[PDB]
Scaffold this motif. Structure first.
Motif, PDB file in Angstrom:
ATOM      1  N   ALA A   1      68.697  24.881  14.239  1.00  0.00           N
ATOM      2  CA  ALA A   1      67.526  25.979  14.241  1.00  0.00           C
ATOM      3  C   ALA A   1      66.363  25.743  13.394  1.00  0.00           C
ATOM      4  O   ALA A   1      65.276  26.027  13.711  1.00  0.00           O
ATOM      5  CB  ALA A   1      68.229  27.409  14.014  1.00  0.00           C
ATOM      6  N   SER A   2      66.632  25.344  12.131  1.00  0.00           N
ATOM      7  CA  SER A   2      65.552  25.330  11.053  1.00  0.00           C
ATOM      8  C   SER A   2      64.707  24.049  11.403  1.00  0.00           C
ATOM      9  O   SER A   2      63.626  24.278  11.112  1.00  0.00           O
ATOM     10  CB  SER A   2      66.323  24.912   9.648  1.00  0.00           C
ATOM     11  OG  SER A   2      67.311  23.764   9.688  1.00  0.00           O
ATOM     12  N   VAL A   3      65.275  22.993  12.090  1.00  0.00           N
ATOM     13  CA  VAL A   3      64.636  21.812  12.338  1.00  0.00           C
ATOM     14  C   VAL A   3      63.646  22.246  13.596  1.00  0.00           C
ATOM     15  O   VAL A   3      62.437  21.857  13.594  1.00  0.00           O
ATOM     16  CB  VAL A   3      65.446  20.668  12.711  1.00  0.00           C
ATOM     17  CG1 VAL A   3      64.587  19.361  13.128  1.00  0.00           C
ATOM     18  CG2 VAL A   3      66.328  20.193  11.386  1.00  0.00           C
ATOM     19  N   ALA A   4      64.421  23.081  14.214  1.00  0.00           N
ATOM     20  CA  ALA A   4      63.649  23.402  15.933  1.00  0.00           C
ATOM     21  C   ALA A   4      62.245  24.077  15.485  1.00  0.00           C
ATOM     22  O   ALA A   4      61.293  23.864  16.104  1.00  0.00           O
ATOM     23  CB  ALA A   4      64.537  24.121  16.622  1.00  0.00           C
ATOM     24  N   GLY A   5      62.511  25.169  14.684  1.00  0.00           N
ATOM     25  CA  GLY A   5      61.364  25.801  14.442  1.00  0.00           C
ATOM     26  C   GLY A   5      61.504  27.452  14.734  1.00  0.00           C
ATOM     27  O   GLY A   5      62.036  28.048  13.755  1.00  0.00           O
ATOM     28  N   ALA A   6      61.132  27.518  15.949  1.00  0.00           N
ATOM     29  CA  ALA A   6      61.552  29.119  16.392  1.00  0.00           C
ATOM     30  C   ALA A   6      62.775  29.538  16.038  1.00  0.00           C
ATOM     31  O   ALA A   6      62.867  30.401  15.243  1.00  0.00           O
ATOM     32  CB  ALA A   6      61.309  29.116  18.104  1.00  0.00           C
ATOM     33  N   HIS A   7      63.815  28.820  16.512  1.00  0.00           N
ATOM     34  CA  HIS A   7      65.159  29.460  15.951  1.00  0.00           C
ATOM     35  C   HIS A   7      65.277  29.482  14.402  1.00  0.00           C
ATOM     36  O   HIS A   7      66.141  30.180  14.056  1.00  0.00           O
ATOM     37  CB  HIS A   7      66.546  28.524  16.878  1.00  0.00           C
ATOM     38  CG  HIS A   7      66.756  29.093  18.135  1.00  0.00           C
ATOM     39  ND1 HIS A   7      67.758  29.516  18.499  1.00  0.00           N
ATOM     40  CD2 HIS A   7      66.021  29.227  19.150  1.00  0.00           C
ATOM     41  CE1 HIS A   7      67.938  29.831  19.815  1.00  0.00           C
ATOM     42  NE2 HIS A   7      66.651  29.592  20.312  1.00  0.00           N
ATOM     43  N   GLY A   8      64.583  28.805  13.851  1.00  0.00           N
ATOM     44  CA  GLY A   8      64.564  28.722  12.324  1.00  0.00           C
ATOM     45  C   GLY A   8      64.052  30.049  11.662  1.00  0.00           C
ATOM     46  O   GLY A   8      64.764  30.640  11.002  1.00  0.00           O
ATOM     47  N   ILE A   9      62.796  30.519  12.039  1.00  0.00           N
ATOM     48  CA  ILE A   9      62.227  31.573  11.751  1.00  0.00           C
ATOM     49  C   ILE A   9      62.894  32.902  12.166  1.00  0.00           C
ATOM     50  O   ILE A   9      62.911  33.874  11.653  1.00  0.00           O
ATOM     51  CB  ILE A   9      60.824  31.786  11.939  1.00  0.00           C
ATOM     52  CG1 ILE A   9      60.596  31.483  13.659  1.00  0.00           C
ATOM     53  CG2 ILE A   9      59.890  30.644  11.338  1.00  0.00           C
ATOM     54  CD1 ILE A   9      59.209  31.826  13.933  1.00  0.00           C
TER      55      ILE A   9
END
Length: 63
Positions: free
Chosen positions: A11-19
């Protein structure tokens, strides 16, 4: 079969799912000011914490 520590890393790497996961960390970030303009951000708590079990695990989860 995947757990949180599984989608959390990606999720953190993906971006969206990260924030999105930061939702929990954001709650405190807003408290910094100490004015959380009551009204909206207040009622949201009605179903805001629900995203906890939603995002926590990925769709491919029997949860």
């Amino acid at each position: 079969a995947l757990e949180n520590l599984v989608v959390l890393n990606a999720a953190s790497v993906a971006g969206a799912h990260g924030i999105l996961s930061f939702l929990v960390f954001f709650s405190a970030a807003w408290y910094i000011k100490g004015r959380l303009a009551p009204g909206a951000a207040y009622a949201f708590y009605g179903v805001w914490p629900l995203l906890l079990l939603l995002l926590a695990l990925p769709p491919r989860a029997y949860a």
